[PDB]
Scaffold this active site. Structure first.
Site, PDB file in Angstrom:
ATOM      1  CB  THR A 269      -0.951  -0.238   1.262  1.00  0.00           C
ATOM      2  OG1 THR A 269      -0.188  -0.110   2.345  1.00  0.00           O
ATOM      3  CG2 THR A 269      -1.482  -1.393   1.112  1.00  0.00           C
ATOM      4  CG  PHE A 396      -5.667   6.234   4.810  1.00  0.00           C
ATOM      5  CD1 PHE A 396      -4.514   5.505   4.205  1.00  0.00           C
ATOM      6  CD2 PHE A 396      -5.561   7.718   4.534  1.00  0.00           C
ATOM      7  CE1 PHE A 396      -3.409   6.177   3.560  1.00  0.00           C
ATOM      8  CE2 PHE A 396      -4.461   8.296   4.131  1.00  0.00           C
ATOM      9  CZ  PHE A 396      -3.314   7.556   3.654  1.00  0.00           C
ATOM     10  CB  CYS A 403      -5.630   2.551   7.216  1.00  0.00           C
ATOM     11  SG  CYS A 403      -3.602   2.425   7.333  1.00  0.00           S
TER      12      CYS A 403
HETATM   13  C1  HEM Z   1      -0.801   4.558   1.667  1.00  0.00           C
HETATM   14  C2  HEM Z   1      -0.595   3.409   2.691  1.00  0.00           C
HETATM   15  C3  HEM Z   1      -1.755   2.716   3.225  1.00  0.00           C
HETATM   16  C4  HEM Z   1      -3.066   2.785   2.656  1.00  0.00           C
HETATM   17  C5  HEM Z   1      -3.408   3.832   1.441  1.00  0.00           C
HETATM   18  C6  HEM Z   1      -3.765   2.091   3.452  1.00  0.00           C
HETATM   19  C7  HEM Z   1      -5.171   1.776   3.270  1.00  0.00           C
HETATM   20  C8  HEM Z   1      -5.955   0.905   4.154  1.00  0.00           C
HETATM   21  C9  HEM Z   1      -7.454   0.591   3.980  1.00  0.00           C
HETATM   22  C10 HEM Z   1      -8.270   1.202   2.869  1.00  0.00           C
HETATM   23  C11 HEM Z   1      -7.549  -0.335   5.002  1.00  0.00           C
HETATM   24  C12 HEM Z   1      -9.142  -0.764   4.952  1.00  0.00           C
HETATM   25  C13 HEM Z   1      -9.198  -2.272   4.602  1.00  0.00           C
HETATM   26  C14 HEM Z   1     -10.400  -2.954   4.572  1.00  0.00           C
HETATM   27  O1  HEM Z   1     -11.239  -2.440   5.364  1.00  0.00           O
HETATM   28  O2  HEM Z   1     -10.784  -4.083   4.153  1.00  0.00           O
HETATM   29  C15 HEM Z   1      -6.580  -0.311   5.759  1.00  0.00           C
HETATM   30  C16 HEM Z   1      -6.629  -1.188   6.739  1.00  0.00           C
HETATM   31  C17 HEM Z   1      -5.601  -1.386   7.682  1.00  0.00           C
HETATM   32  N1  HEM Z   1      -4.253  -0.867   7.261  1.00  0.00           N
HETATM   33 FE1  HEM Z   1      -3.648   0.382   6.022  1.00  0.00          FE
HETATM   34  N2  HEM Z   1      -3.033   1.320   4.546  1.00  0.00           N
HETATM   35  C18 HEM Z   1      -1.857   1.925   4.248  1.00  0.00           C
HETATM   36  C19 HEM Z   1      -0.633   1.720   5.002  1.00  0.00           C
HETATM   37  C20 HEM Z   1      -0.499   1.058   6.168  1.00  0.00           C
HETATM   38  C21 HEM Z   1       0.368   0.743   7.020  1.00  0.00           C
HETATM   39  C22 HEM Z   1       1.867   1.480   6.776  1.00  0.00           C
HETATM   40  C23 HEM Z   1       0.043  -0.019   8.258  1.00  0.00           C
HETATM   41  C24 HEM Z   1       0.778  -0.288   9.477  1.00  0.00           C
HETATM   42  C25 HEM Z   1       2.232  -0.703   9.156  1.00  0.00           C
HETATM   43  C26 HEM Z   1      -1.128  -0.090   7.939  1.00  0.00           C
HETATM   44  C27 HEM Z   1      -1.937  -0.926   8.779  1.00  0.00           C
HETATM   45  C28 HEM Z   1      -3.501  -1.339   8.641  1.00  0.00           C
HETATM   46  C29 HEM Z   1      -4.443  -2.153   9.378  1.00  0.00           C
HETATM   47  C30 HEM Z   1      -3.880  -2.655  10.944  1.00  0.00           C
HETATM   48  C31 HEM Z   1      -5.524  -2.193   8.831  1.00  0.00           C
HETATM   49  C32 HEM Z   1      -6.730  -3.108   9.581  1.00  0.00           C
HETATM   50  C33 HEM Z   1      -7.438  -1.867  10.410  1.00  0.00           C
HETATM   51  C34 HEM Z   1      -8.237  -2.485  11.629  1.00  0.00           C
HETATM   52  O3  HEM Z   1      -9.014  -3.531  11.437  1.00  0.00           O
HETATM   53  O4  HEM Z   1      -8.168  -1.991  12.629  1.00  0.00           O
HETATM   54  N3  HEM Z   1      -1.640   0.238   6.852  1.00  0.00           N
HETATM   55  N4  HEM Z   1      -5.645   0.343   5.419  1.00  0.00           N
END
Ligand code: HEM
Length: 464
Positions: A269, A396, A403
């Site tokens: 991502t 996000f 996220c």
């Molecule tokens: C530009 C970079 C990133 C984007 C655009 C992004 C975007 C997203 C999106 C759209 C989701 C929702 C997924 C869903 O509902 O199916 C998500 C979930 C998540 N992302 Fe990111 N993400 C990015 C970077 C990161 C990074 C660097 C981390 C940690 C190292 C991270 C950790 C997570 C986690 C843990 C979730 C689950 C949230 C939860 O259930 O509490 N993401 N992300």
């Protein structure tokens, strides 16, 4: 039944709706269909399943209502959970370890926590700048080098492991394993019922890879609980922090899953955000000039940036937000229907149906974005930001399941762009034609740029 039916587009007994699923990036085929159906949503009757893509900003404001539609692990995430476990990304909010992990990690991912990771972020970014310095005039493999950058950063901030991915062309055996495991996970969706000889052994190797990663991270945990735990690291934090509500700590198994989860959800991502951003600056070079100027006001000479520096940025943050609007790197995540519901007062959603947010259409929907298909970094400014449709920017995720890593990825990528533009002049030597590949995430595939060191007299600074 008594109301409106969701629109479905039919295409010959030959094929069916299945043709909309072939290719390297189906989400882009969905985007082409969303431009020609202004209703706000559509449906594809694939064999055995129905997929509903929604993109009208008011229909999305409805799907964003966690009182009616929520994230659900079942179908969509069940394979990625082979290695995500019950960590944040691959679990349902009602499983005990989600609430626990959420309540423990949320503060460690806040904007206030970022300063504490800046040192490690800067280490990895400077490694990257070194590799490109040492290879000037060579083809820079953009996707791959951003993958390196972010994989290394999230490992170093996540469990204080240095994979030193800029020292050598070969990735550490652990990351090679991660790579093979992720790709197998993405192919597991298309399962022919007859299992070929090589598929069964693919699966054997698959769980062997998962085991070898589990092994390295189990050992890091063992060896630091032996040293008293308590590092200033996401792993250090999870070894000691207690849940504010349950009073207990995370298990060892759950901590390994959260570390795996950082890797899965955080590397492709973020690296894709950077790959795409560089492509866009290459195809919108006046913006890139603006970025150069920002870098030369705040980082003249061989100044070394601080967290403060990144925070006083303006052009580079808005470049990043607008880039996320064009090419959000998780483009098609679905919300599930908690109960039978009616959307827009018009359409009939049976309980348990998946509504995929078509993020590309939503971010470029002309109802919400005047001149949708044009790059303007001034859309994001304090005043103009307040004028955006409140459900039409969702790079996000949404609500409880948004996220956690947003601020981590955005500080990492601000720093990356900052240091790159400080030192290098970019060139496009091959007329790169954007080519998007979709797995869990979308990203540019064969992107090659070239860099020269910037000569002193080419900096837009003010002399010493
Ligand atoms: C530009 C970079 C990133 C984007 C655009 C992004 C975007 C997203 C999106 C759209 C989701 C929702 C997924 C869903 O509902 O199916 C998500 C979930 C998540 N992302 Fe990111 N993400 C990015 C970077 C990161 C990074 C660097 C981390 C940690 C190292 C991270 C950790 C997570 C986690 C843990 C979730 C689950 C949230 C939860 O259930 O509490 N993401 N992300």
């Amino acid at each position: 039944r008594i109301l409106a039916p969701i629109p479905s587009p039919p295409k010959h007994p030959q094929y069916g709706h299945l043709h909309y699923l072939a290719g390297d990036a189906p989400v882009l085929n969905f985007f082409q269909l969303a431009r020609q159906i202004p209703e706000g949503l559509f449906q594809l009757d694939i064999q055995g399943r129905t997929l509903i893509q929604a993109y009208d900003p008011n229909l999305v404001a409805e799907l964003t209502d966690e009182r009616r539609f929520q994230k659900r692990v079942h179908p969509a995430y069940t394979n990625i959970r082979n290695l995500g476990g019950d960590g944040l990304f691959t679990s349902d909010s009602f499983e005990p370890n989600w609430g626990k992990a959420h309540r423990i990690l949320l503060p460690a991912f806040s904007q206030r926590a970022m300063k504490g990771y800046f040192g490690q972020m800067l280490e990895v970014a400077q490694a990257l700048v070194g590799k490109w310095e040492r290879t000037q005039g060579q083809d820079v493999r953009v996707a791959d080098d951003m993958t390196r950058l972010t994989l290394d950063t999230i490992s170093l901030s996540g469990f204080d492991y240095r994979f030193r991915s800029f020292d050598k062309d070969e990735l550490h055996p652990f990351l090679q394993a991660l790579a093979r495991a992720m790709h197998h996970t993405m192919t597991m969706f298309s399962r022919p019922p007859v299992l070929t000889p090589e598929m069964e052994e693919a699966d054997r190797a698959y769980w062997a890879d998962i085991a070898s990663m589990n092994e390295l991270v189990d050992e890091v945990i063992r060896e630091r609980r032996g040293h008293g735990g308590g590092g200033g690291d996401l792993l250090g934090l999870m070894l000691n922090a207690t849940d504010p509500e349950t009073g207990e700590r995370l298990s060892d198994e759950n901590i390994r899953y959260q570390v795996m989860t950082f890797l899965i959800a955080g590397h492709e991502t973020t690296s894709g955000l950077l790959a795409f951003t560089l492509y866009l600056l290459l195809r919108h070079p006046h913006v890139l000039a603006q970025a150069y100027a920002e870098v030369d006001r705040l980082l003249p000479g061989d100044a070394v940036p601080t967290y403060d520096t990144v925070m006083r940025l303006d052009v580079i943050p808005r470049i990043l937000d607008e880039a996320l609007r064009f090419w959000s790197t998780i483009p098609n995540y679905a919300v599930t229907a908690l109960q039978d519901e009616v959307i827009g007062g018009k359409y009939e959603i049976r309980k348990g149906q998946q509504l995929a947010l078509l993020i590309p259409a939503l971010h470029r929907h002309p109802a919400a974005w005047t001149n949708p298909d044009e790059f303007d970094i001034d859309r994001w400014t304090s005043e103009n930001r307040r004028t955006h449709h409140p459900a039409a920017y969702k790079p996000f995720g949404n609500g409880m399941r948004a996220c956690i890593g947003r601020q981590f990825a955005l500080t990492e990528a601000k720093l990356a762009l900052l240091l790159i533009l400080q030192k290098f002049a970019l060139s496009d030597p091959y007329d790169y034609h954007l080519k998007v590949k979709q797995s869990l995430t979308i990203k540019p595939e064969d992107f090659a740029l070239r860099v020269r060191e910037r000569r002193p007299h080419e900096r837009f600074s003010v002399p010493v």
